[PDB]
Paper text:
Putidacin A (or LlpABW), first identified in Pseudomonas putida BW11M1, represents a class of Pseudomonas-specific antibacterial proteins not related to any known bacteriocin. The crystal structure of LlpABW from P. putida BW11M1 (LlpABW) shows it contains two β-prism MMBL domains, referred to as the N-domain and the C-domain following their position in the amino acid sequence. For the protein containing two similarly folded domains, we constructed site-specific mutants affected in carbohydrate binding and domain chimers from [name] homologues to show that mannose-specific sugar binding mediated by one domain is required for activity and that the other domain determines target strain specificity. The [name] branch occupies a unique position among MMBL-domain proteins, harboring non-eukaryotic representatives and being equipped with the capacity to kill bacterial cells with bacteriocin-like specificity, a property not yet demonstrated for other family members.
Residue numbers in the entry: 2 to 276
């Protein structure tokens, strides 16, 4: 008793979800569209940079293993089941990633592959604690996403941008995310209720307070100090608890993981590592 895979149907997006079979001809693109992860018909798994191959899945890739594949019926396929696996009979091989040590069996359901805007492919244990906009696709790995760290006040009237989208704690006291076409994709519905403050707290809860620290609205995500709040260029807003467990560069099993930062100390949705 345990999950079976289904065919991937997300060609051109930046994420390969768990237990989904990517087959020949299918590909991911980074959100900025510069990079493409392609499974070729010749059985090579390839990353291309503006159309040119700059990486190939093989034995020379740090923290990956190649073991025999004797099963004759195994179709060419690439998929994620905590670790990533490339079944390539043509070379009698399974190529797979040596992930960081697993902490829970739940990770098998939550871990997906992200093709980032910096060209890295990263396996990320990802849990959406709150998703304000379930109809809008989650798009990890984009340089133009806005991330707020816990402990970030949303100053009233300030427009926080992510490409053409924005998040605003408005003069009328509503907390609103606007999508690329100028329409609201989500709002807390707190206009006219005396809202005085909106804050993504240190405990990972997004809260709008009124007079006397009255709670007018909250995301019910308290107790997650490692969560981030993300506004995407497509208008998606969500609170996520995420950690990487493999990457093709930068990653080492014993290194600590952190998000890259802008020159003004703001975090970016791109994973990196250091001791």
């Amino acid at each position: 008793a345990g999950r079976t895979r289904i065919p991937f149907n997300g060609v051109g997006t930046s994420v390969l979800p768990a237990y989904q079979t990517l087959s020949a001809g299918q590909y991911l693109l980074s959100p900025n569209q510069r990079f493409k992860l392609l499974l070729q018909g010749d059985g090579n798994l390839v990353i291309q940079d503006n159309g040119a191959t700059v990486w190939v899945a093989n034995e020379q890739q740090p923290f990956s293993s190649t073991i025999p594949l004797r099963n004759k019926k195994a179709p060419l396929a690439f998929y994620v089941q905590y670790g990533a696996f490339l079944d390539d009979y043509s070379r009698r091989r399974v190529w797979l990633t040596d992930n960081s040590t697993f902490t829970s069996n739940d990770q098998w359901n939550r871990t997906h592959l992200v093709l980032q805007d910096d060209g890295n492919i990263v396996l990320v244990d990802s849990l959406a604690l709150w998703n304000g906009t379930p109809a809008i696709p989650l798009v990890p790995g984009a340089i133009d996403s806005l991330l707020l760290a816990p402990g970030s006040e949303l100053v009233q009237g300030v427009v926080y941008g992510a490409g053409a989208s924005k998040l605003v704690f408005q003069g009328d006291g509503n907390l609103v995310a606007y999508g690329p076409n100028g329409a609201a994709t989500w709002n807390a519905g707190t206009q006219g209720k005396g809202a005085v403050r909106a804050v993504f707290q240190g405990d990972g809860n997004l809260v709008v307070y009124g007079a006397g620290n009255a709670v007018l609205w909250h995301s019910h995500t308290g107790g997650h100090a490692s969560a981030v709040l993300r506004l995407q260029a497509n208008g998606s807003i969500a609170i996520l608890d995420e950690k990487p467990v493999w990457a093709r560069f930068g990653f080492q099993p014993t290194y600590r993981h952190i998000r890259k930062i802008n020159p003004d100390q703001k975090p970016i949705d791109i994973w990196t590592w250091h001791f």
